[PDB]
């Protein structure tokens, strides 16, 4: 599938992603440097932060208890649609997923 990423400035990048890649993995492996991801996809930092598009949130499995507490330690304050991009797993149904990246991760 394919994920759309949007920078603070509003510009877009379409990145390939296989089924099963996290959104972070997909980002890092196709040139999206802004996603710092200190812990390397290991669900223990708040630095792979993203905002899921208002319309795509519903299609994702819910945030768990761990991701939820991680999210209130973000560098840019959490929004309703905030997610940890290493905790988003890509599936056919997310082909087209839109993610916007915060002003900062650290
Ligand atoms: S990269 Fe550390 S939680 Fe996603």
Automatic annotation (TrEMBL):
Provide one Gene Ontology cellular component: cytosol
**UniProt keyword annotations, A-Z:** 2Fe-2S, Iron, Iron-sulfur, Metal-binding
This protein is called: Ferredoxin
Q: Which family does it belong to?
A: Belongs to the adrenodoxin/putidaredoxin family.
Give one GO term, molecular function aspect.
Answer: electron transfer activity
Where is [2Fe-2S] cluster annotated to bind? 39, 41, 44-45, 48, 86
Q: Which domain of life is it from?
A: Bacteria
Q: What GO terms in the biological process aspect are recorded for it?
A: P450-containing electron transport chain
């Amino acid at each position: 599938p394919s994920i759309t990423f949007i920078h603070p400035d509003g510009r877009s990048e379409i990145v390939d992603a296989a089924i099963g890649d996290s959104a972070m993995f997909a980002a890092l492996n196709h040139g999206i440097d802004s996603i710092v991801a200190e812990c390397g996809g290991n669900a223990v930092c708040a630095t792979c932060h993203v905002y899921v598009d208002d319309l795509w949130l519903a299609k994702l499995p819910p945030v768990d208890a761990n991701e939820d507490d991680l999210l209130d330690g973000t560098a840019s304050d959490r929004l309703p649609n905030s997610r940890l991009s290493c905790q988003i797993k890509i599936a056919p149904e997310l082909d087209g997923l839109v993610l916007r990246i915060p002003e900062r991760q650290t």
